[PDB]
Design a protein around this ligand. Structure first.
Ligand SMILES: [Cl-]
Ligand SMILES: [Cl-]
Lengths: 403, 403
């Protein structure tokens, strides 16, 4: 079983006070707090084992630590091979890498690409720049009122010119989990590849990219209780070894000549130019170990119970509008009466409750719902029923005071 | 005055043992060790102040810490304005950013770009990919035997079609410091812009980009006694606010619409997509503080004396070939007799002496000297006369044993 009190003991930030009051951090979807095991694994590497990667001993051990983290990450998402994983800055850079290296040589004038109306900007803007570069069309799967995809529109959007579906696994605003396996079957029937944005999935339940059969999969370390500046791009081996490089420089070359040109090295490493973020890679590996030791199924069970408790308690908040489906994961998007989200979040911060307010990097989603902004509370593995009670009580107080 | 013993006390890695013997780390040019003040500033941020950047309190304080580091970095290199600095992964990503955002809209078919024969691959490969994309020509300033540029060839290389000179401040192999101010005057007389690769300069002496009048300047945090995964790209305000975005996604947009297109936000931030590497940014700011507190002029004086001692002592090594000028900064590139550098570096590692062997991401430089590889010892602010003595003695032993 899961013990939230033992877990919280690993997270030093949770002891913090904000505005004189004890912090209730309900913004893990924007970025997750990190346990001491992750923080110290990075610090200890800098303290005792630091060197540049790729003869001498510290450098050879550091190179081996980084390839071990690549292997551990590939097992964490059940990729066939460690060499199907590229180290990137985060989800955003991973998507841009695919959009340029794979997009520029596989999406031509007159083609189309399909995204959804709930996509994070990370999974919109690189496809808009790709379509502008090659003269292709960006198609959009629209939303239902309850925050799910209008799956009936897929036949009018998929045709023989559809090169790619780029789709979120779990919405960072609505908490909707999309039916990826079926959508990927449909997409593959047309010869379309599928990129999955998994930035909000990998911390809530197990993820298996062989079962999903996605062609690309991306996520960020810092939302997986890990350090900033590191993330993972998974690509099917057969596609990856055909993709050209994106960033150029050291470590991604085989030979460099000023008169005979330059040749590239083999995949993953062809896509990793310059000094890797070894500090972040070390912290990411520790983050995967820590999460695996708790067990993603145990995390999923505790988070689902906490979510059901929260949705039940929030029924006692007058004039509360929720957005998204009842079976959401991770986040609760809401607005309080007619009050602007900025004001609501500001009162909640004043009680020491951290929630995010604004467009959540999902402006088309906001426009679909005809609001400028939303509040969002995240309910992660280290959050408690008591913090939910503080959120409920605070919204009630804000309603009485401002109503 | 400088006290190397007090400085070394800040660096926990220096206590390490390698192969049972005390470490002599002479590979700071590949990556620098970090002081506790840098390591702990990052750890403490994760422990007590962590949040996503850009209403609630932790997030507002984190956003302010990152913009303070941007300001501190701009003062460190004497840029006019903090908004002339873009946070990048490192030198390599900074150069690729310029090559794509600025290069693609300013270098056309039939134009030419000038680099030097001593450039790191980071400052070659992105210009080769740019020239291949737009149909331009890559011109090369050749070397003199002593490791300096053949400055006489500049009139045959600069013409009216020269769009850009990309040039290293200090060679990572030879330790040559190039006459940047004069070369930038010449380049500007033709309407050419100048990118300076400063990755080997910013830790050895003060750097002033207003005095240099360079148009772009790049360096890496991890060689500046800082964390991995962070670096700085400086661009003159007038050029930067004309440059289009490179990576797309959150935080670099002003508005995102699926029907009316997307607009971009103002410079620096237009070039920073997705979650910044706040952990690395915090560590970088601490690294700049630590180096400023020692004083770059004090570092330069101690490192120059250590270098003169090393070059004098190495005269007692039979069959030692040195590469580069006598007034080198930071590094000593050498080969021992006819022995391959890999073997020499392997014996030195066995004595607990870390040097780098290989092409040092400078294959054209190696070919100029008609060798496949070189050894390189770095002499940084925390290295000692005693470690030089260990290097000298070790090379002597290797010569006797293998000669
Ligand atoms: Cl290389
Ligand atoms: Cl945004």
């Amino acid at each position: 079983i899961f013990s939230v009190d033992k877990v919280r003991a690993d997270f030093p930030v949770l002891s913090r006070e904000v505005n004189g009051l004890p912090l209730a951090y309900l913004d893990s979807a924007a970025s997750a707090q990190k346990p001491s095991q992750v923080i110290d694994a990075e610090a200890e590497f800098y303290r005792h084992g630091y060197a540049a990667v790729h003869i001498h001993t510290l450098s050879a051990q550091a190179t081996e630590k980084m390839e071990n983290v690549r292997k551990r990450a590939s097992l964490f998402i059940n990729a066939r091979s460690a060499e199907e994983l590229v180290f990137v800055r985060g989800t955003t850079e991973g998507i841009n890498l695919v959009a340029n290296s794979w997009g520029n040589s596989n999406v031509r004038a007159g083609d189309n690409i399909i995204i959804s109306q709930m996509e994070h900007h990370a999974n919109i803007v690189p496809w808009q720049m790709l379509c502008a570069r090659v003269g292709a069309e960006l198609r959009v799967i629209p939303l239902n009122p309850d925050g799910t995809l209008q799956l009936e529109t897929l036949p009018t959007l998929f045709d023989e010119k559809t090169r790619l579906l780029a789709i979120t696994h779990v919405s960072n605003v609505l908490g909707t989990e999309n039916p990826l396996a079926e959508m990927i079957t449909l997409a593959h029937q047309h010869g379309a590849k599928v990129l999955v944005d998994g930035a909000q999935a990998v911390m809530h339940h197990p993820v298996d990219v062989q079962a999903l059969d996605c062609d690309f999969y991306v996520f960020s370390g810092h939302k997986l209780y890990g350090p900033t500046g590191i993330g993972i791009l998974y690509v099917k081996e057969a596609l990856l070894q055909e993709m050209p490089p994106w960033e150029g420089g050291g470590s991604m070359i085989a030979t460099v000549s000023l008169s005979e040109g330059t040749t590239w090295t083999k995949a993953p490493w062809r896509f990793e130019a310059g000094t890797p973020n070894t500090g972040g890679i070390i912290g990411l590996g520790a983050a995967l170990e820590y999460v695996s030791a708790l067990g993603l199924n145990n995390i999923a069970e505790y988070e689902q119970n906490l979510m059901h408790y929260a949705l039940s308690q929030l029924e006692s908040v007058p004039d509360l509008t929720l957005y998204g489906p009842q079976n959401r994961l991770g986040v609760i998007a809401f607005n309080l009466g007619k009050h602007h989200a900025y004001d609501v979040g500001s009162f909640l911060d004043n009680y020491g409750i951290a929630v995010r307010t604004g467009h959540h990097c999902a402006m088309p989603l906001m426009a679909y719902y005809n609001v400028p902004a939303m509040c969002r509370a995240s309910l992660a593995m280290y959050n408690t029923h008591e913090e939910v009670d503080r959120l409920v009580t605070g919204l009630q107080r804000i309603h009485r005071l401002l109503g």
